[PDB]
């Protein structure tokens, strides 16, 4: 029973990693398509010149 | 990964929408409206690096080539370097954009 | 003596404008590629991790 605990922790540690990751990445993504006002460039390289 | 992503939030809430330029009608002298931060350090920031640039300018023409004035020029090019820098640290990529287009 | 020093100033003066122009148009496509440098660094370093 201890050792299915741990692995639930595990396995939700690693889906947090997972996770953090892909929202992490998602502030290097550059929006294509002009329409999306939301997504506000965070990186000079973004551009903006 | 999580204390990562918490400082690139912050930079995005900082970057959305923010800092208006009024169009400092130049006769209007009096109203203190007070300059947006991030367009006081631009200027600076520039206008230091302008001084700077001048006076290697007024150097190259006055062709006196006092020995000991490297020392000082490294300073102050460190000085701007230091300066642009805390810029960049200080406000957003995009804050700084808009203010060098006003500028 | 005092207006050709002059002229040879106003020379001097002309050069380093024309020095300028030119630095100012190489520094200009200098941030079009680094521009382009980070980028191509995002798309082809960063993006690939969260697959693997």
Redo the contacts between chains.
């Keep these: 029973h201890l050792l299915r605990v741990t692995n639930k922790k595990l396995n939700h540690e690693l889906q947090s990693?997972?996770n953090?990751?892909?929202?992490?990445?998602s502030?290097?993504?550059?929006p294509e398509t002009a329409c999306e006002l939301s997504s506000?460039?965070?990186?000079?390289?973004?551009?903006?010149? | 990964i999580q204390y990562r992503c918490e400082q690139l939030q912050e930079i995005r809430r900082a970057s959305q929408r923010e800092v208006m330029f009024s169009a400092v009608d130049p006769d209007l002298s009096s109203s203190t409206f007070l300059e947006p931060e991030v367009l006081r350090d631009v200027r600076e920031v520039c206008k230091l690096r302008f001084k700077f640039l001048r006076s290697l300018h007024d150097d190259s023409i006055s062709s006196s080539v006092h020995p000991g004035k490297e020392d000082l020029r490294s300073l102050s090019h460190q000085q701007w370097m230091s300066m642009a820098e805390k810029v960049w640290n200080t406000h957003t990529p995009n804050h700084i954009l808009a203010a060098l287009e006003r500028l | 003596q005092n207006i050709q020093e002059a002229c040879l100033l106003l020379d001097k003066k002309q050069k380093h404008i024309q020095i300028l122009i030119k630095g100012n148009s190489s520094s200009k496509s200098q941030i079009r590629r680094s521009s382009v440098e980070a980028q191509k660094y995002v798309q082809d370093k960063l993006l690939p991790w969260p697959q693997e």
């Design positions: 990693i997972v953090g990751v892909q929202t992490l990445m502030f290097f993504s550059t506000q460039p965070i990186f000079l390289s973004q551009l903006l010149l």
